[PDB]
Amino acid sequence: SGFRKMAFPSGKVEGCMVQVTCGTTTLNGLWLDDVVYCPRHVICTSEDMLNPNYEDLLIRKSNHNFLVQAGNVQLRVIGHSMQNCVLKLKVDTANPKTPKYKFVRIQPGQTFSVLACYNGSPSGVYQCAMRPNFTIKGSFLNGSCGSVGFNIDYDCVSFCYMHHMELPTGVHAGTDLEGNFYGPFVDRQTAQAAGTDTTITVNVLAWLYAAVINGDRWFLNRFTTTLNDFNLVAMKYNYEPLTQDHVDILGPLSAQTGIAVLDMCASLKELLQNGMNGRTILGSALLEDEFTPFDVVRQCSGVT
Amino acid sequence: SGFRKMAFPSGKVEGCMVQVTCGTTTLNGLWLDDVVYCPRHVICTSEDMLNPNYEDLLIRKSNHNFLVQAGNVQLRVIGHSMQNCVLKLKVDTANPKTPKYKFVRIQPGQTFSVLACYNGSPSGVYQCAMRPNFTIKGSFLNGSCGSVGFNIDYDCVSFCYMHHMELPTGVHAGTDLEGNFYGPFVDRQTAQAAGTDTTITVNVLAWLYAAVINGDRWFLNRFTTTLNDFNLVAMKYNYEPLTQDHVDILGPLSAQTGIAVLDMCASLKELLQNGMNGRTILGSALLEDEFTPFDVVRQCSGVT
Ligand SMILES: O=C(Nc1c[n+]([O-])cc2ccccc12)[C@@H]1CCOc2ccc(Cl)cc21
Ligand SMILES: O=C(Nc1c[n+]([O-])cc2ccccc12)[C@@H]1CCOc2ccc(Cl)cc21
Fold it and tell me: A54, A135, A148, A165: which to mutate for ligand 1, most atoms within 8 A of CB?
C-alpha cells in the first residue's frame, strides 16, 4: 500500500557517469563500453552559445582537448565524432561497469528516471515524463548537462534522454542518445518557447486506478462515458485525446479493479468539471500525470 | 531551475541489499561489513505475527535456519543475535561493496530516501519524511520488509530506517538500524492507529523558499507576523509549531532570497487562510512538507 513517485534504482547508471571538459566548459558524460556520450555544446564558450556553428567549432578541437575523468582517474581519448547534438568520445578503456543497455527514443507521455549529475558525480534521482510539448520538468543547475534519463527492464538500462538545456521558462530540453532533440529545440542560446503542456490523460487514468488499488475511492462516480464524449471534455481541459490504444493499455488496471476504462473516464470527466473540492487523491490536490499504466502495474506488483 | 522530489543516488545502498529467508518467510536484509541486518519478524509465520514472543521463537532458530543470498550466491551465517526489533546475522564474508556508513536515528520532519526492495532486489527509490506521528508514507508491498531509508553526505551513507510494517490505514512503520521503532509501534499484527499527521511547518517554509528561488512568487504577500501569531494559525491548521531553531535553520534560504523568515511565515499564514484558489506552487496544488531546509539548499546548490 501507498503510492509514490518512484525512480528506478540508479546504481547501474551511476557507474557510467563521467566528467567531460573541453577548454573551460565542464559537463557530464555517459560512459558505455569505450565511448563517452556528451552534449556537443561542451565545445562552446558562453559567447559561442549565442550562435554556434558546431561543425566549425569542432574543427578547432582534437582528441586531447576533451578531458574525460571517471572518478579521479583520467581516460585517454582516442577518437571523437559528432552525431547530431551529441559528441561520442572514443576512449581506450571500456567501462568495466557498463550495464546491458539500449538507446531508445521515447514518446510523449512516457516516464523515465533522471540521475542528475554535476562534474560527473551523481547528486540525486527523480522521476519525470516527456511532456506532450517535448519538454521535461526536471531539476537541473549549471553543470547538469549530460545527465541522463533512463528506464530499466530487470538488468537492461534503456537510456532515453540526455539533458542539454533550460528554456527561459525553467522547463528543460534534451536529446535521445543518438543526439536528436525531443521536440523542436536546438542547442543554441536563443529564445525558444514551449508549446501547450497538455495533461497525459492515459497517465492520469492509470494513477486513478492506482488510487483505487490503494483505497482512495471517493472520486468513483456512478457514470460512464464514451471516448468521443470524454474527449470533448478532455480537449476543453487541455488533456491529451484518449485513444482505443490507451484503453487497451489500461486493460490490466481495469481488470485488477473491476472498473471499466470508460467508467474511470467518466469519473475523471466529473473531477475535471467539479474540481477536487479541497480533497486529495493519493496525497495530491491535482491529477497526477507522470505515472504510466506500466509504472502503476510495476509499482503495484513489485517488479525488480 | 525546476524543483523535484529528489532521492539520493541509490547505488551505494543497492550494493548492500540481500535476501533473508527463515523457514517460509522471505524479506530483505542490509549487508554491511560481515553483518546482515533484517526485521526480526523474518522468524515468524503469518499466524505467529498475531502475538509473537520473539525471544521464544528465536530459541527454535539456529545459524543454518537463516538463508542469506547476495545476488545468486549464498552467504554463510556464523552467528545471529536480536537487537530490539532487528536481527543481526553475522556472515563469514564482509560485504565488498560496504560503503562508509553510520546508523542514525532521525527526528520527525527529517527526510530520507527509501530503496524499496523485494527478495533482496531493488525495485525503486523514492523520497519521504518521518512524519510528526512517526509513521512514513511509503510504497511497500509484501516482501518489502527490510528495505531501508538513508541519507548520503558525499560518500557516507547514514542509514536511518528499516521497513517493518504497514498499519491498517496504509501508512508505514519501522525502526532505526538499532531495531528501535520510530514512534509507539510494535512488530505485531494488532490494531495500531497513528496519531495526528501534522504538517512539517519548517519544511513547507523551505519549499516556499525553493519556489521563490525557482520563480514561483505569486504567493508572496505584503505582510509579516511573529512566531506567536503564526503559531496560533499553525495550530488551527494542524501544522507543527515553528520554533526559533526552525527560523535559524531557514537563515540560509532567507539570505539567498532576501525574504525574512517571518515574512515567509506571513505568506504561509495567508495561504492557509485563503487557500491556493486553484493555483499551484512548484507544480503542486497543496503545500509540500517533505523537503527539509537542507534538501532545498542541497538541490538549489548542487551538492554531489
Ligand atoms: O542551458 C544551459 N545551461 C543550464 C541548463 N539547465 O537545465 C539549468 C541551468 C541552470 C543554471 C545555469 C545553467 C543551466 C546552457 C547555458 C547557456 O544556454 C544554453 C543554450 C543551449 C544549450 Cl544546449 C545549453 C545552454
Ligand atoms: O506489515 C506486514 N507486511 C507488509 C508491509 N507493508 O508495508 C506492505 C505490505 C503489503 C502487502 C502485504 C504485506 C505488507 C507484515 C504482515 C503481517 O502483519 C505484520 C505485522 C507486524 C509486522 Cl512488523 C509486519 C507485518
Answer: A165
